[PDB]
């Protein structure tokens, strides 16, 4: 079996303003095999109401998934995406930057 590591983008659906409801996205793509663990973290702690898209793939057979949750950004709160996959010795954490 070939093994491709996931590329990760963490981002909001809309431009982020404090106190305005939004959606936090972790887009994982370019990976193989399909079994992957993806969590959204609020200040290091796992968020519970996280949904994801239906598994699909690109022309080169590599998989992609969108994980997402509704959230209200604030000045203080830290958000991040935690991804684990057979290609990774440790789970990779990508922080949500406001850009980006």
């Amino acid at each position: 079996m070939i093994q491709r590591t996931p590329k990760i983008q963490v981002y909001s659906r809309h431009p982020a303003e404090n106190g305005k409801s939004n959606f936090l996205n972790c887009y994982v793509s370019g990976f193989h095999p399909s079994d992957i663990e993806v969590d959204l973290l609020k200040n290091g702690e796992r968020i519970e109401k996280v949904e994801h898209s239906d598994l699909s793939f690109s022309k080169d057979w590599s998989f992609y998934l969108l994980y997402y949750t509704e959230f209200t950004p604030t000045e203080k709160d830290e958000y991040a995406c935690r991804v684990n996959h057979v290609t990774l010795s440790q789970p990779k954490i990508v922080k949500w930057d406001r850009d980006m």
Partner: protein
Amino acid sequence: SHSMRYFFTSVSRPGRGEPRFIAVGYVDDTQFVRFDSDAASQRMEPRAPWIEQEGPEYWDGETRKVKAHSQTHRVDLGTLRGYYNQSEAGSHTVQRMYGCDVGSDWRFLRGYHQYAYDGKDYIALKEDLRSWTAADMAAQTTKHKWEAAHVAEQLRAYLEGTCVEWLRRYLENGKETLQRTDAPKTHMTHHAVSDHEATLRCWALSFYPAEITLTWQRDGEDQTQDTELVETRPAGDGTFQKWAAVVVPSGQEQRYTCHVQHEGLPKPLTLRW
């Protein structure tokens, strides 16, 4: 130009039970149906409002067909484990994609039917819909089998005929969304990297379809150096996002222009700080 595609993934589960099977259907960049072997319904389910118009006989048929697809992929996993001399202990993956493109004229343009095992090309129907690309000697076995059983002709009949007819049906029933372009909402941001230099980022938001080109120029000339182009990503509401950035000397921001090409834009857009 428009397209209908179905994507199928089966993952064997050696520990216990039958494989995980996930099927999804798209018109262009809009997912409209799904099946998941781990979901409760065991039905083909809708994922866009315009397919919900379809009556009970559509959903019974698609459920029957998708389950038959599920069993073919289960059997395939067994077949390929044998062909590749693998044990029963490991998890393996089969992937299959098929479908059709129509042109601006809404007439058949291209058909596809291709297959991978453990993420590597296995077999693909070629553009003529009459011949096969077998990647290795396992796939050659499948090729000789499929040529003897005239699989290409059966697929051709679907891909040139029924497939295009479904696509046309869906494009009409979903026209409010499927035949609407959403032009990118563009803007530029400015990030000071030091006293000497700045990063200009050109944003393209809320666009559909996903296909888009973002390019930077300096003084009106294509620049590749010191740029960064992210992969196009889903917003989650059916639209897409992308950005491109360029690092520039501070005070020279005005020399640089971001150029945006999209189907929803009559003439290309130009942004400047």
